[PDB]
Amino acid sequence: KVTQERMEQIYEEVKTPYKYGLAVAPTDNYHKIDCPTVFRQGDKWLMTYVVYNGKTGTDGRGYETWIAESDNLLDWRTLGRVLSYRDGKWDCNQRGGFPALPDMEWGGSYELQTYKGRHWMTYIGGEGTGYEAVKAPLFVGLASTKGDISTAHEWESLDKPILSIHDKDAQWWEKLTQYKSTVYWDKDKTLGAPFVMFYNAGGRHPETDLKGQRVGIALSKDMKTWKRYPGNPVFAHEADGTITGDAHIQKMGDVYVMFYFSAFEPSRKYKAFNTFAASYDLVNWTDWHGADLIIPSKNYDELFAHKSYVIKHDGVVYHFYCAVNNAEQRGIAIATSKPMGRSAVRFPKPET
Template identity: 60%
Template structure:
């Protein structure tokens, strides 16, 4: 293929034939067994599929007498450069990657080397191989192009020590095809999108009519694979999407309830809290006039923009859909996990009230198993209320608090965040039941001691003899620490089990430059069989601010290094669908903040969708999370609900490495004694 950058990229014939190298082996499966490099050619048009003629023997194998130590296990992908200038004395230069163990360091990895030929049939290895080596992980799939007097090699790396990305595309440059200088900036392509969040690798890059087209293999965390494209100039968006992944076969099944909802809005300007849960309200619901909606959904599309007396839309929103009873419920519990319903939620299954929640910015989970029919369809009904003159929640609209027209912090009306149907064992980890942290001084240069608390519950009718396994794995899914304990759960019992994870080597630190995340895999086992599994991301980092010991140093320290905080405050609003954001919209907002140069993010002024925190953890922005009391009602009901919401807010976010501050108020003053109670909690 023509290697000229910006050239025609045409396939050239040598001796009236077209040539290809390829890998193959005698074992079925993807890259299984010992692989060798073969050669094939054709004199037919390559634009039409047909069988090429192969040679009788491979042209390179890991058993050849002249093989190097770096290729003594197997050979991988190859690409051939036709160098008309014969930089290395031969016209054909094959770049190929191979697996081998370094005899000095004992490190196993994939590295890139070259072989030379003057006729495409007989190849000689370069004696100075490998020419590109990162000593660990994968370096491979090189494709070389010519930019003026410079050679540029596009390649991918994976599982490279010290790099947070599983697999990514990058490049290096050379004047002589032997000595290569790596690009040390951000990778050209790395896992960042829902379709490539597992691997983004294997480059094919062309420059055409002023635009760089970077084609690559995209693999998501559902192990779906496709060809993705990145361009140097915006070319719009592809309408092609991966199909909905198969329902996971894990012991805990989590399904989003996005479609199939109908909603009806009952507008009012006075409190309807007295009607919560009353059967009469359900009987009075209309039979017609319901609107088909998709979750997340919010009836308040940012009502405050109208600058009316009430900065919020007040009323009661009803949502309904059918829900099939899961098959094989024996020994299982069926749970509804609501990420956010504003501002009061009451949930009914088959006309039976199964739960109620106050506060639209924190999550709640309800066990609906006993309300389900043995089989078939069930009626799910959710009542979402945001009445006027709320006095037990910390953020209300101006028309309800003497600030007419005030709309800052508009509150949602509806199921404004996703809803999940979860099928789990009767003995299971409770929602947000895994807590891990590091005490001061526990992260050291030779390891770390990490505290873990796991809260479990049983709905079984008999005692259960169980095993709790906590596995901490790194970004490459390699286990770094493990703890195992046996325990007994009595019927209806809830227990919090302590463990300590001991890392034998210094953990990678989470920082704004390198937001490295580990994953804690929590398993509950019975008789050797896993019956529940929960995964919790975690980052190791230390925070110090202000500097103690009376030094007067007011700087912020992250991992014992001073860091200038350049932050932005963001409201969870957008005209038209305020609060009801998709995961893609949230990721886009954080991407905008990071692209603008900010390294810190403040929630204004209530807990945002948890996907904000997940994105901040992943992208390396510090977070100031808030549950602010903009309006303070000095009543027992307000104090009680504020503490309840505060506990939910912290438990949901307590494992996040990005959170360095918790905010209790905004433009208001909590009584000092109550603020101290909140801080202690």
């Protein structure tokens, strides 16, 4: 267990009271933007994000992945697609990606690392139309490139998923559908392998029969073949339909810090929010006991303020999150540790 005093120190280091506003927003009501991943190469900051091309749960085709650039982390310009709808393949309608092998050092370089001469990315993939797993389940895909990661070009991907709900060794917590994944390069081989994936998925608890989303681990020597960690799930909040998800891990000295979101947690009035947990060993996690890091408070995040990517740079923390309002308009927003101005970006007028 991480001590209460150490946890209070981590909170003071990571907190972001001041909301800048929207970073990337849709220009009409028939697109939704979510799932930021921020990294840098040389003189540019970069963000991948996912786009759903509908207003309701059933009118869009599904996810594609785009990329944007910035000089100051605050003002962003979209470049184009990096994963596009892929006709004839297992992931034809859902292609929602998360860059892999980030430098995990808190306040470090924020560069992506290479393995066998390529950059890597995992993704949410599937063949059903509509929003996420509404028409068919989602599985974990693998993509890579030898290209310039600061350019809008299509990354290459495999012709089957790397993990699936239909695998012989799939576990109870992942039987309904899989969701976000991130792969880390653990030089120490803490769990007996160089590549460690944290991912969330849906399933029912074998004791209580309660449905929810929970977080677990898979392991690989080569990025291609994966074994589930036998002690899964490693992090969960057990109440009916509660979601724990989108794990984002950074190393702060000798402790790992997991930024995560939860939704439909009965102990909170608001419906979705961000907070953190900590661990010395990647498996046993101590949950923060104090105020949540990001909660609904403004017009543009009044329903959900959720999902995390966190950058510490030149003495300022930037916390990227998905803002959803009561009209269900959806985009990416930013909060900071000190005031850095206010965004000029707005959602379009909502539909009546």
